[PDB]
Design a protein around this ligand. Structure first.
Ligand SMILES: O=S(=O)(O)OC[C@H]1O[C@@H](O)[C@H](O)[C@@H](O)[C@H]1O
Ligand SMILES: O=S(=O)(O)OC[C@H]1O[C@@H](O)[C@H](O)[C@@H](O)[C@H]1O
Ligand SMILES: [Ca+2]
Ligand SMILES: [Ca+2]
Lengths: 479, 479
């Protein structure tokens, strides 16, 4: 039974790898995986934002089924811990499980006292070991959580977090721009730590504050500690990167080296972080009997809140590589992300694969790998794609959901986006460089003639529109 | 029968890899090789300069036995095309052979007419295909030699080359500093090509003129085509980089990216080119039955002829990694260079290896691997080291010669340098930033206690000094 490692990059776009087209900088370590293994060209995150994609990846359930949406850093755990989870399925098969990186699935069951035992958390979800950034890099609280406790927390300088009003004695970005390494939009202009303002306020916790620049070393180290401690048994590591999420404050090992600014330097950081872990697996002789899944939680974004020159220094770079949309979108670039799989022992055919695969398929696929029988209720929306994960010649799905602020479905070459008639959060206004694809009219595209989704042919094909819409409706009605 | 790829870097120091301690730049493709295979810490080129090390590589025979030393671009071939070579030996075992990169071994047998079929050359030494820089990048002729003919030669505009006198209409660096990308010493201030002045003068051949900045594309493209043409037979690629020899004119992809200027930038270019070919083997499915040898032709130099900010932008980087000497030197860093070997289908044990081994042993090791018996008189100074090469727990040599302007020998922990009572090139006086170990006294070091050869114990060990000189004497006298 192989080891499992899931490299999970924050906001990595389809074209954000040199093995997926990037010319202005290279990602040699990740590029090496694609050369050896299977490079997926029609693989998808379950959603176009973070919290819902992670929810599906770990539960095998569509995010809308529990209304999963981008969370604050003090939100309660959105996964019901009394139910099967992907890591839980693996412990069953005898795996040691661990997660090192950004969480963003919630913590606790109502009110998080950051100075006491924090639970339910990952450990209650079937992870033997955890070391987390609570939410995202740009949200408070601004600390690491190891298993059930905040790291380097001092009793006499206790932590409190607010998303309602300003608390504590830390400067805030709006009032002290001279303390800011980069300027930030109003949503991101609250409590300053390590010269960067964040979303929300945090009081206390000086001993426990993180230093963004120190991430690549902190997180690779904990990972390697986990691989070391558990090398004598079957282990699974979930490594959700904070990179390349804002704020991009890359390490000086990378800063200014991509020629694309902090966004590009962050891609570089990710690729070096990946390499440290892969190479350790190589040195310790674990690599050949390890299945590595490398992917992303959603599509790319340039300016996501900070004045980090992403647009000014982008040049010719296209982080979606010719697909319409990006982060937050129902268009292909919202969910169509790099996925690369390596497993020397088990891959029958290396090469590029265009199997229609969604990250929600990982659940049942690993189950088959681990030899675990699933309940009829466990991972209901998941499908076994293990053949297509190990053979670039196998096909994957017939049809596939993509979740955004609306819902969209792929059925072969067809791309349908259901009409949206709700309201969207105020911060979405900031992201208009990206076409979100939310219209009150139906949209239908043939990606085989129209890869970029520029020609809506729903008036040409009402037969098809009605069909695919009922499919989305029927999916929502699955009981 | 495994394929064989030899990556052979120019002037690569023991510490010019982050897998060997380099901190100011990252060499991920080469470090990935190190992590998977065996990383050698006591591995040596035969000599502390280019031509002789290359000579002992292909002949399995010490350089002094033919007075082999750094050659001008118009020197006749110094390897006897009538006698066996490493490529010829491989041809006996069925391999399709090729060399892409620099040569520096000489061409022809006296007068080279560059506008006609150049023979003898690499082809008569058992190479099926060759694409070459005839000498060094800082040496005329600045053209490519493909098999027996100059690439993109226009017969109306014939090439002539001289190292004695100025010929032709091209400007020289001594008259036109305004035309240069960087300033040079007077040795390197002759003919200007692509905005860099060379050693010696070249008339004619405008269409053949290469461009340093395109070297990575041109040469990785000829290597990959060589592979992709012979993916179906057993083959061997000798891939002698011009990186990182002076002039350092890195492609814009790497310019300014290392922090250490052109010298470090050439290291990044080296690594990118390695990954291009590594990734090719992996994509075509060849990697697992391919043995890769990665090493260097001699130790490191900072300033070697051009003003390229090597020293200024060094920081705290030590290319000799604490070893004494370097390029041209009789001290350890003159020959002790990085060496790495992978061969997924053959490596017994991976890891780090302190086997005392030399590049002269690659001949007889490969002849075991290819199963070819050698004459009593073939590769006579070569020894089979295949077990140390493929098993990180295996040891190597009892003794080992090191060649420079004097002779030295390693004898386990012992290092002895034979006194030097001779004369040296005026240009070596441009190289005094490095200690060359040329002394009229004998030198003895216990590398066990004195890694950086600081304490000459010739006085404390008169009998040992006699024994090791004696062996050097006996080694010269081998008929
Ligand atoms: O990948 S995500 O965690 O979904 O990104 C979360 C996003 O939420 C938005 O409200 C912020 O303006 C963004 O700056 C970003 O933090
Ligand atoms: O790497 S080597 O080919 O050994 O170096 C040859 C050297 O010859 C010397 O005359 C020059 O001053 C150096 O610039 C360098 O070209
Ligand atoms: Ca995300
Ligand atoms: Ca050299």
């Amino acid at each position: 039974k192989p080891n499992i490692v899931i490299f999970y990059v924050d906001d990595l776009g389809y074209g954000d790898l040199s093995s997926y087209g990037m010319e202005q900088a290279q990602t040699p370590n990740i590029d090496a995986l694609a050369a050896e293994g299977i490079r997926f060209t029609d693989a998808h995150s379950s959603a176009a934002t973070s919290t819902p994609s992670r929810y599906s990846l770990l539960t095998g359930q569509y995010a809308f089924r529990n209304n999963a949406a981008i969370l604050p850093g003090d939100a309660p755990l959105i996964i019901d811990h009394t139910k099967p989870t992907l890591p839980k399925m693996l412990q069953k098969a005898g795996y040691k499980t661990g997660v090192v990186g950004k969480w963003h699935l919630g913590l606790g069951d109502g009110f998080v006292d950051w100075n006491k035992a924090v639970k339910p958390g990952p450990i209650e979800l079937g992870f033997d070991y955890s070391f987390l950034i609570p939410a995202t890099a740009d949200r408070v609280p601004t600390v690491f959580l190891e298993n059930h406790h905040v790291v380097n927390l001092d009793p006499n300088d206790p932590i409190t977090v607010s998303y309602e009003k300003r608390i504590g004695n830390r400067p805030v970005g709006t009032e002290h721009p001279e303390l800011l390494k980069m300027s930030a939009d109003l949503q991101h202009s609250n409590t300053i730590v390590d010269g960067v303002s964040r979303i929300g306020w945090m009081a206390g916790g000086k001993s426990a504050e993180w230093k963004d620049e120190e991430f690549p070393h902190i997180f690779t180290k904990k990972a390697i500690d986990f691989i070391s401690d558990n090398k004598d048994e079957s282990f699974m590591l979930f490594f959700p990167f904070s990179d390349i999420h804002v704020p991009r404050v890359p390490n000086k090992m990378f800063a200014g080296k991509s020629g694309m600014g902090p966004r590009g330097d962050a891609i570089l950081q990710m690729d070096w972080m990946s390499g440290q872990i892969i190479d350790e697996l190589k040195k310790q002789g674990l690599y050949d009997n390890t299945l590595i899944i490398f992917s992303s939680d959603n599509g790319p974004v340039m300016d996501d809140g900070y004045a980090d020159q992403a647009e000014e220094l982008r040049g010719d770079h296209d982080p979606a590589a010719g697909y319409r949309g990006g982060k937050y979108s129902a268009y292909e670039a919202g969910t169509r992300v790099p996925m690369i799989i390596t497993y020397p022992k088990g891959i029958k055919n290396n090469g590029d694969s265009n199997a229609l695969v969604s990250q929600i398929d990982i659940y049942k696929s690993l189950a088959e790998l681990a030899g675990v029988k699933l309940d009829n209720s466990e991972a209901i929306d998941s499908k076994n794609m293990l053949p297509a994960f190990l053979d670039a010649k196998e096909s994957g799905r017939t049809d596939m959901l993509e979740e955004s602020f609306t819902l969209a479905i792929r059925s072969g070459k067809w791309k349908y986006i259901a009409p949206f008639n709700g309201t969207t959060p105020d911060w979405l206004a900031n992201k208009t460089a990206i076409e979100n694809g939310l219209k009150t009219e139906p949209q239908l595209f043939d990606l085989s003639k129209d890869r970029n989704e520029q020609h809506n042919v729903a008036d040409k094909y009402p037969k098809l529109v009605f069909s695919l819409q009922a499919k989305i409706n029927k999916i929502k009605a699955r009981k």
